[model samples]
Target: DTGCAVSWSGKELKCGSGIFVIDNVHTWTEQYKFQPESPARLASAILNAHEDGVCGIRSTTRLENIMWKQITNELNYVLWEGGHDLTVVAGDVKGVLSKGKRALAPPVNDLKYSWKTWAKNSTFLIDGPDTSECPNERRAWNFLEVEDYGFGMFTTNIWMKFREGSSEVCDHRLMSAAIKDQKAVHADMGYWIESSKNQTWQIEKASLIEVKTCLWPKTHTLWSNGVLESQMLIPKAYAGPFSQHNYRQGYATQTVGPWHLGKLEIDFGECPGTTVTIQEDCDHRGPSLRTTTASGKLVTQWCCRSCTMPPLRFLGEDGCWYGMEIRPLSEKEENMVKSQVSA
Candidate 1:
């Protein structure tokens, strides 16, 4: 048996590997145009350039009178129909539109329909090949996990996935370390307050400090043009939970306050540096006030301006550090984080 190929007028049209071609002819002006044939030609061209396989019919067209808009619309309809069953299986839109317009004449002042409505009504119903048969399906990444930390913050873990290109190469582990290394905590906090007051903290009432930890990969590398570039990952925001004893009684507390981060940002290039800053109230305390490095170096500064004694600096090594002022939860806030974990 001959393998499927797209052809028009007995002339083979380029149809990239895996493209399906239907043998159908539609009249265009005075000549017959093979609809499937044109798509086959286009698909073949795309495949040759991208080295990615293409599918569908093989054929050519001689009609030049068709407007670009009409051609595209017709191709969109065809692909929609051909992939209708796949769409149903995937439960979403999964196709492309051609650039050419339909050849039909348009009436002036016709009622306009949005592209969304047009697509919803124009989708086809036929099922194509089963996707399970595709060998590339085995190489995709289905999920990504993220861990986030910051002052006045709760622990958060998130998962994400790409609809297309599910390959493991796309899997990523991004941390807030980017924000910790580059931003000047004091300056950024000041800027953040200027932008939004409800979010800012008074310096005298908040405590701002730097975070130092070896919680993430120290470095990463990227490859381009067969060359590899090394990059570093730095901690950005220092985050954790606070006990209820740190804040004054009856004070309203926000999960992200005591110190509001200006902006959380990250950069990855030849030489990577992550920085972050925060707006804070100077009086905040509760969690451990100091962080120590593996080498026993202190990483935080603390002192009460109202105190007669000088400010003190301490080291953090217990993997626990001061994050924010712990405020007694209101009746409303108390119900928000009810834990099954009993003390």
Candidate 2:
């Protein structure tokens, strides 16, 4: 049981014991028509309701019209979703609150590499094959180091499988290689953030970068291809485009942007509901869909949404990738996110 504040239709304000010390009465009165009599009485009533296993607002007002907050502590409070099934036993407040989400475990295909020095001059290609009507391929990432170059790069991989009557093939190759001018591009990598002891969440807060190399006379490489060649800080996320959902079909040439060597059959998966596909055409795009080469060939790639801003991925210290929902934020929403961070 802790202190809290409640608002009804943005008109009535009620505060429990300790919260009043820090609450701005004048501002709240102007904004929410503060309730002066026995604030703790009603506040405590709601607290008692929750304590006694009540699922929703203790009073008659619908939860939809009431906004409440746990003012005692920021970290351990509930977002307050009231539901039934009172028979369920209580667990750690926060843990139980987040149980609706998939548990934070290492994601599928999370690989680890040795930290020791390895030969500097070697090109290692990791590949695998699987038979599936839909590309159910997963994601993998690791830190790559060279014997002579020290800590080299943070690398990642994905496999795209082309479907042919319950038969498909997935191969891992460099995106740069498919771009033709492989030597002309440079990608600044991003790191995974470890959010919890047993769970990781997403990428770093700041974005990353990828650039197409400039061409100079035979002497040295120039840094411009005329217009905005240095595609500054880019959001780094690559979603594999193969899933079991029913989707529409689209046509494209073998080389659609950076994909090559196949008659492109783009599988446009239907996102869960009626929400239309949102596209970010900043160089490339996917709503978790893939382009299969009718020739039974495919390569791994991230969707164009990542180009606007990659969703963050969390990593457990134990080398696991955690998954979570992410969405594009409006300016107000972005500020709200900033308010949540301590420093």
Candidate 3:
């Protein structure tokens, strides 16, 4: 037997949990940061967060952070748009459900029921087996089976956890659970250093919410001394190329990737943060990269937009609004509206 364990408080109730350790989590940081995520791993982490919470130790930075919300909205946009396309099969998609795609708009004082759900639990693995080791894992594969790697765990393991109750679509049960636990640790990956370069990510304080109520199957013993190893975080900081920009109020930096590069620092009262200043200095940064830069450029923008609202607005060639109408009145209100109009 591989000697497993369990530990919990004596609440005369119940609790793979950790209240186990709470000191230096820096030692194992990289272990989780770049660790390849699999269904087993992600499921464990999600379950871990639900059972106990995670602690976050962000790298104190001089620069502003690209909130987790922004990164996920873009992913949500990706998910909403390609999700149906992904499952289209080899036939006609003309009559497919109309709700699969979303428009990327800007966030504002939007209504409560109408807010977008950027952080929905991934559909990539709902019924999929835990791993290649799963007895029937292959059975769950469909169009979602990317390449041969099954569902890409990168998109799932690394994601957003907004303020506990921000969006109904958010797995807030999971969010608040993490918020309440004292042992979990969430920290940044710290600035960027290519894989060719050297570095050490820490994971120690070392212990680490709720809802999307994932009634997943019980798999292992995690509520013990070391199960606290179940923790998570985003890149705390990273240095990147900065450029010129034009914006009046809502200005983001001329970015290289998710990093905002450098602040625009100026606004002539009408600049709308829409320009990038070219460097005038080895063609300014050399063939430090080219082809990679193109794809990198593609990925950069999506992950950095501050608050791209889900474009919920729609228009028809007839110029009539289809998806942009106000939500229908409640059942009782519907009858009253009909009576009033007739009267």
Candidate 4:
């Protein structure tokens, strides 16, 4: 419920596999960054690059003949994820979403080329995994399809499994600090509004969430690395909700840009006896947090901090690699961290 005025956005970019995206995830948010590591594998390696024959099957490549003519072309949407206690491998379960009387299936795996789903806590990849629903009651789009029936899907086995040992605090649900206006759409209501108004959720719209999703490049050669996906509008949202009784969660990371392997989540609402502390940056990942709940009658406005940026092949800390965000090791990531985390 973006409250009607149309909220929720990380720089919008939606268009089932008609992809393109790069830079500007809030100019590069923190926590090293996220929005990969799902069932995405560059449209499941375009059918695992044609049964591993990539340009095989008698080569002549036109991007693998437009990815074998986009598998079956049936795309309407596709980001792909897994559920139903998933368990697949190599590829199977091509039965969409069905159930109730007991018929709808999607928990098996095996039916020819392109698959993966060993559901070990499920990060189940998608090769043909499909689903549809959202032309009005919006909230049902977990897809994968390059087949004419789809919009050409792709996933690159997104990675990152950080946050080890024990330290997890979550109650999540702090959206819309507002950031939308894909050129501010409007037709009747006078001269169109929602340009993010006077704009200033600073620290990049209240700490974290700058997702500019669209990935189909981790490569076996399905190029087209930059330019895809478009649609966004947070218009407005950021009232802070803290119901009281106290809330807490923690984790942290990132300080000098581009090391956010993961980690950086936090919560400390309720504001009662209020006790909050957090900090991290420079490789373990952690940094993102916010506060303000109990509206109608409160007093507080914010943006004390949040921001990180990096690029051009960089990584340092004894394990080396660099070109910019420099790091000679011996300690160089004060970058900044505090308030457990958020985003």
User: Number of the top candidate by TM-score?
Assistant: 4
Write the candidate numbers in order of decreasing lDDT: 1, 4, 2, 3
- lDDT computed for candidate 3: 0.19
lDDT for each candidate structure:
0.23, 0.20, 0.19, 0.21
User: Residue by residue across 1-343, what tens digits does model 4's lDDT show?
Assistant: 2222222365544333321222222233222211222233333433333233222121011112233233322210132232223222222222111111101112123222244321244322222232342111121112211211112144222122212221111111111111233322111101111222223211111122211111111221111144122111111111112111011111111222222311111111223322222223333323322222223122122211121222112111212122112222222224322222123
- Lowest summed-lDDT stretch of 10 residues in model 2? 94-103
Q: List where candidate 2 sits over 4 angstroms from the true fold.
A: 1-224, 227-271, 274-343
lDDT by residue for model 1 (1-343), tens: 2355454545856544542322111111222221222332322222232222222211101121122223454434434544432111111111110111111111122222223111443221111232434322221112122233223233222222112322212112431111111111112111110011123211112222222111212232211123111111111122211111112221223222212121222111111121112224344433222233345443333322122111211112233222223211212222222211111
Worst 10 residues of 1 by lDDT: 188-197
For candidate 1, give the lDDT.
Answer: 0.23
What stretches of model 4 exceed 4 Å from their correct place?
1-50, 53-195, 199-212, 215-286, 289-343
Q: Quote each prediction's TM-score.
A: 0.18, 0.15, 0.15, 0.19
The superposed Cα distance between candidate 4 and the true structure at residue 288, in angstroms, equals: 2.4
Tens-digit per-residue lDDT, 207-308, candidate 2: 111111111111111222231212211111121111111111121111112211111112122222112223554233211112222242322232233321
